[PDB]
Amino acid sequence: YATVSKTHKTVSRAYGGSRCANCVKERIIRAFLIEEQKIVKKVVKEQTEAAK
Amino acid sequence: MRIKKKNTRGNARNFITRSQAVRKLQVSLADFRRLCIFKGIYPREPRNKKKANKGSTAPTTFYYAKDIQYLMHEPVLAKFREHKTFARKLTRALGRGEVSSAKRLEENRDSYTLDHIIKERYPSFPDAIRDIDDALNMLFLFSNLPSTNQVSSKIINDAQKICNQWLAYVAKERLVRKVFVSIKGVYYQANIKGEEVRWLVPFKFPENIPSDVDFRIMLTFLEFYSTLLHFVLYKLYTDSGLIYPPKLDLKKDKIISGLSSYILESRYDSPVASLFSAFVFYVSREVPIDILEFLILSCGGNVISEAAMDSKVTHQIVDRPVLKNKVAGRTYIQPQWIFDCINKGELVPANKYLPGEALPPHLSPWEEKKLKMIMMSNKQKKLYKKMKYSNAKKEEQAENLKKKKKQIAKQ
Amino acid sequence: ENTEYSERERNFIPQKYSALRKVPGYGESIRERFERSLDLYLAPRVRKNKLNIDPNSLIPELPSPKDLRPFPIRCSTIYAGHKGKVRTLSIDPSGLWLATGSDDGTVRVWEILTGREVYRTTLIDDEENPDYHIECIEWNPDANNGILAVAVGENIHLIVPPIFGYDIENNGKTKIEDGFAQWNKPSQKQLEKDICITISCKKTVKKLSWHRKGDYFVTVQPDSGNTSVLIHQVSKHLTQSPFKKSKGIIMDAKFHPFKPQLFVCSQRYVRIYDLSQQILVKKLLPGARWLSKIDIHPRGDNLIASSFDKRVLWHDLDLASTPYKTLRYHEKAVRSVNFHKKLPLFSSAADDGTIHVFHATVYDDMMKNPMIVPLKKLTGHKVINSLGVLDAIWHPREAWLFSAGADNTARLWTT
Amino acid sequence: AREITDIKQFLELTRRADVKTATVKINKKLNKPFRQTKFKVRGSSSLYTLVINDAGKAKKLIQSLPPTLKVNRL
Amino acid sequence: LNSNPEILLRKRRNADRTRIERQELAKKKREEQIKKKRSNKNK
RNA sequence: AGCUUAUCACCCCGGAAUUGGUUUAUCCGGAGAUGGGGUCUUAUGGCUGGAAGAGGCCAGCACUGCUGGCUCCGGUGCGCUUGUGACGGCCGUGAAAAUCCACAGGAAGGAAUAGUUUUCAUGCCAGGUCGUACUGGGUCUCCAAG
RNA sequence: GAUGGGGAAGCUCCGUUUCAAAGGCCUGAUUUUAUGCAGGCCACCAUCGAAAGGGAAUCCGGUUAAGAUUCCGGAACCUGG
Secondary structure (H helix, E strand, O other): OOOOOOHHHHOOOOOOOOOHHHHHHHHHHHHHHHHHHHHHHHHHHHHOOOOO | OOOOOHHOOOHHHHHHEEHHHHHHHHOHHHHHHHHHHHHHOEEEOOOOOHHHHOOOOOOOOOHHHHHHHHHHOOHHHHHHHHHHHHHHHHHHHHHOOOOHHHHHHHOOOOOOOHHHHHHHHHHHHHHHHHHHHHHHHHHHHHHHOOOOOOOOHHHHHHHHHHHHHHHHHHHHHEEEEEEEEOOOEEEEOEEEOOOOOOOEEEEOOOOOOOOOOOOHHHHHHHHHHHHHHHHHHHHHHHOOOOOOOOEEEEHHHHHHOOOOOOOHOOOOOOOOHHOOOOEEEOOOOOOOHHHHHHHHHHHOEEEEEEOOOOOOOEEEEEEOOOOOOOOOEEEEEHHHHHHHHHHHOOOOOHOOOOOOOOOOOOOOOOOHHHHHHHHOOOHHHHHHHHHHHHHHHHHHHHHHHHHHHHHHHHH | OOOOOOOOOOOOOOOOOOOOOOOOOOOOHHHHHHHHHHHHOOOEEEEEEEEEOHHHHHHOOOOOHHOOOOOOOOOEEOOOOOOOOOEEEEOOOOEEEEEEEOOOOOEEEEEEEOEEEEEEEOOOOOOOOOOOOOEEEOOOOOOOOEEEEEEOOOEEEEEEOOOOHHHHHHHHHHOOOOOOOOOOOOOHHHOOOOOOEEEOOOOOOOOEOOOOOOOEEEEEOOHHHHOEEEEEEOOOOOOOOOOOOOOEEEEEEOOOOOOOOOOOEEEOOOEEEEEEEEEEEEEEEOOOEEEEEEOOOOOOOEEEEEEOOEEEEEEOOOOOOOOOOOOOOOOOOOOEEEEEEOOEEEEEEEEOOOOEEEEOOOOOOOOOOOEEEEEEEEEOOOOOOEOOOEEEEEOOOOOOOOEEEOOOOEEEEEE | EEOOOHHHHHHHHHHHHOOEEEEEEEOEEEEOOOOOOOEEOOOOOOEEEEOOOOHHHHHHHHHHHHOOEEEEEE | OOEEEEEOOOOOOOOHHHHHHHHHHHHHHHHHHHOOOOOOOOO
């Protein structure tokens, strides 16, 4: 592989050279859900602090 | 042989990184850069950056391996260590309390000399003249600067003495060819054996010393240039048959303290060196006698300074708003006459520089292609576009100058 | 003063000091010397050679275009009054009737000289329907038939109007109706619209190319993968694929002028397939990312390629796989380039609304590279919606160039 | 070894002037026999061989060969 | 082309940043010295 | 070395159960099958160059080689060696390093008498030393025709 | 199996990370009471051990008194610059 062009070795995608694009979607969805929950957790923290 | 790693041959080992060079030399960056300046070494850029920098894309600075290796053998490296050891031992004595021991140690120390650096840096005498421009500029700048906590008074005095000796040698041999005056200061272009060396001379006015600049590098540059100019002046004096060092008359030093102070003695070939021949020029108080006197002395006869103990002259230089007396025996000419006379070299008429008269401006002495371009290649097309843009930008120099001249001509 | 440091060629403002005494001191002298000293021992020194060649020397010493006349210089006829934008053009073999196709669902025929809209036909009742529209139209190269192929949606319509006369029209119709994706006989509405036969595949007919034999023609079906190209014959109403497996999306495909091989212009490559054995004869690697239209010299010795990415290329079938010369001058995508059938000329069309005509000599057998030079920049088309000359076709025998644009007004150019 | 169908590429390779010798191989085949022939040149990276079937094309290629290039038969 | 030989100098990057940093450092050092002189007189 | 070529696997439409698909071996499908449309992994085969100028099979003369032909088109496994692809399970979840390759990453550098990048193609130079002979009931080992 | 250590009178035995100051990368205008060096990051740590383990790359034809992936002809492929 030290002489083959990167075009054959790498596909035009994020994580293309090490992932099949199926788990990439899963991890993207997981990250988005984690961010949404963190926003929800911060909202819950603000609600709790509104009383104390 | 076995596999050879990519970053082990070629540009990888041909150039050594500055950080790696410092580690190899085991010398502080200050001393390393001092040695580099003394040897006149500079960084270099290979045709490929990543290849030289072990395949890593970083803004690394590269230096030639051979030059650095040769530097390691310089005695100046050992002299630096000797100086550091002496300083440590002197601090030890000072802390102990035996001042006499510190004085004895100081009386034994000797400073290193860059004589052997100059020999290899400038194998032939003409080479030194071919690059003494920067040395002269730095010396002339420092000679006018005031002493501060950074620069000692002795250094400035030595620089001023070197500048005065150089000016005296130039005046005695009348090697001045072209001169110029600008905002940055007055420019002098002498001809030392044909090298047409140019050197800036700033006005003799106070200069502010901002803290932004670092004189430490300037101190080392001046230290090197001092020895360089000393050797050059000694060689020139020996070639011209003049005694060296040239003694100075203390009586003149008290009065004028300048060009005429140095009485150089042993033991004419160009029109510029013949202007004002056998003439005597009077100089007023307003003009910079330091600059004017040197020009007249190099060009023609002597000059009578406005200074006194506090006539047979033919011309008088004055820049007063209104002429005072205008004795019939003295021709009144503005200072611009001397510069224009030197630039022209044929004694430009004096009837254009009378006192109060407007001075003339001073000038420094120095259709089918549209379709045919289709067949041009990408690189050729870009090159042609760049050339066209360069032509257009240069055309502006004339267009905006002619337009402004037209605007000025209205009145 | 607002400029940053190191971009200060003039480090001060020159002033007209009336007198020497008024000249003030300079406080930046220390700064200048400090900067010079730093540059001396820190600025990377690079050895280089400063160019001094004449700027105009780079221009090649090509023959003067005016000496290669005649070539089109101005627009002489305009087919104004079109309801829709003329997407395609089609000049008959006799060079008498110029057919036009637009998105208004109506095909219009304009005389080459008089410019009268002699005949019209409607293909789609829903002129405003965005699902599909007239894609391309082409006249049958064979004479004595007067058959106009009209590609609208998936329906390929062969039209034989009353323009050419009974005998020629009768022969053309008999050629079409000789059979006694799928082929279906025209309906009453189609018959009223002078449609002689209808052919419909699963995908839309984005492009069409006829063969000089008068029976074989090819269609390009983007977003069809294996079935991106299909070969059709009128003489038997038979459809066959040029090869069993087409790779990638394909934009255009045209038969060789005389050889039994079909050129396939893939998105990134142009390939030659011999229909006798369906074997890949050669592959072309143009210096452009995405070809737009393919063109073949009538002599069959040189090939022209056009690309949407500002690139138009000249290809030689004997030089190498790469283009012989790469041309890139248009301000927008090069929509189409068409060779001249008889004269040694060709012109390129781009979305910028500017048409260029190039003279090109093609040696039949001499071992010398072709000589191609520009002739004239043609202007007059209006750029609309970032689009320009959609199509352009040369006269069968004269040095005239038909044109079509998004401005709903086809044009004809004459010397 | 490599095979190329670009006649002009072969001519340019021969025109390089940095090739000592070239060889043309005559062959016989049938589909109606025909005198198949091959043109071969020596390249720095790999040998380049050109396949020619028409006799006239082979004669034209032979004529196009610069006189400075020697052509050893077979 | 007959291009004449020359020796080009590459841009000394970060010169303006270095100048600004030195000016800020000089100002800070002056302020610190003034403060130290103020403090040392009240011991 | 240049074209063509993949079972498996992957993606889109479709939403099955009135239960469908299928291997020698029976497992899979609302966690998306039958069905329709596309993607590439190219091992392995088909054509060409190397390449018939090689080898082999014949024929004439010289009397010391030359001179002339063929070197073609098929079928096939209860025979045997080997590789490859997905499977069935067993229970011991199953050597390391050198070397090479892959990606989250966006500091660094990129312009008007040659701005950066060279995983594209070609041209240029170099690759030390050690053994290579033979042999191989009392050491091991690779192929096994009808 | 040294390395830093411990026991042994000693020829020597233990111990392989063992409470060793056990090296390997980068930046800066030259570091301000004036040219003696400052700062940013990781914490493993030699070697030997296989001609049946992994591996960068040669195929064919011919040739000898004994040698062939080496010798000759043709055509190949790997690494570094």
